[PDB]
Amino acid sequence: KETAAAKFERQHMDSSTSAASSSNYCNQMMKSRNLTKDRCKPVNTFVHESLADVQAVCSQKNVACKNGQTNCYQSYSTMSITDCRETGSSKYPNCAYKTTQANKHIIVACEGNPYVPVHFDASV
Numbered sequence: 001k002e003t004a005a006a007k008f009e010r011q012h013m014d015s016s017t018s019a020a021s022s023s024n025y026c027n028q029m030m031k032s033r034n035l036t037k038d039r040c041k042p043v044n045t046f047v048h049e050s051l052a053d054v055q056a057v058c059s060q061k062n063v064a065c066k067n068g069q070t071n072c073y074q075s076y077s078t079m080s081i082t083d084c085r086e087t088g089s090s091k092y093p094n095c096a097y098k099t100t101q102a103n104k105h106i107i108v109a110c111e112g113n114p115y116v117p118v119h120f121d122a123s124v
């Protein structure tokens, strides 16, 4: 049974590439990470940094979560990320995404012992 930490890794971690997102990156990644299974997940961010680096964010800048909770953290440094955003023409089950590479600070929610990322809140 998938832990929240494991789900975060599946939904949000892609340490395999430096950028290097083809115009096709999101189409393929959203499907393979199972984010197009029950619906087209409309927005999803993949982070191209080491797991250690992203986990480290849980001890970085404490910031308010969008939901009003206090357990969110913003990375001190910008991180390589790919924003995946459903296109206007996209229709389930043929989910289609615009791929946008950027370098931005990430904000994640962390929980548990060990204290680890469980939710992607924002990129700024």
Ligand SMILES: O=C(O)C1CCN([C@H]2[C@H](O)[C@H](n3ccc(=O)[nH]c3=O)O[C@@H]2CO)CC1
Pocket: 043, 044, 045, 066, 067, 068, 120, 121, 122, 123
């Ligand atoms: O993976 C991503 O990049 C995105 C995944 C979806 N989102 C949603 C998420 O629900 C987040 N949000 C908003 C309100 C809230 O109470 N909690 C949230 O996580 O803000 C985005 C839309 O307002 C952020 C980032």
Ligand SMILES: O=C(O)C1CCN([C@H]2[C@H](O)[C@H](n3ccc(=O)[nH]c3=O)O[C@@H]2CO)CC1
Pocket: 004, 065, 066, 067, 069, 071, 109, 110, 111, 118, 119, 121
């Ligand atoms: O089983 C558990 O212990 C946990 C399973 C996962 N979670 C949620 C929790 O809401 C946490 N979360 C989510 C959104 C948010 O804004 N803040 C969070 O802490 O992320 C997990 C997956 O969404 C808490 C409980």
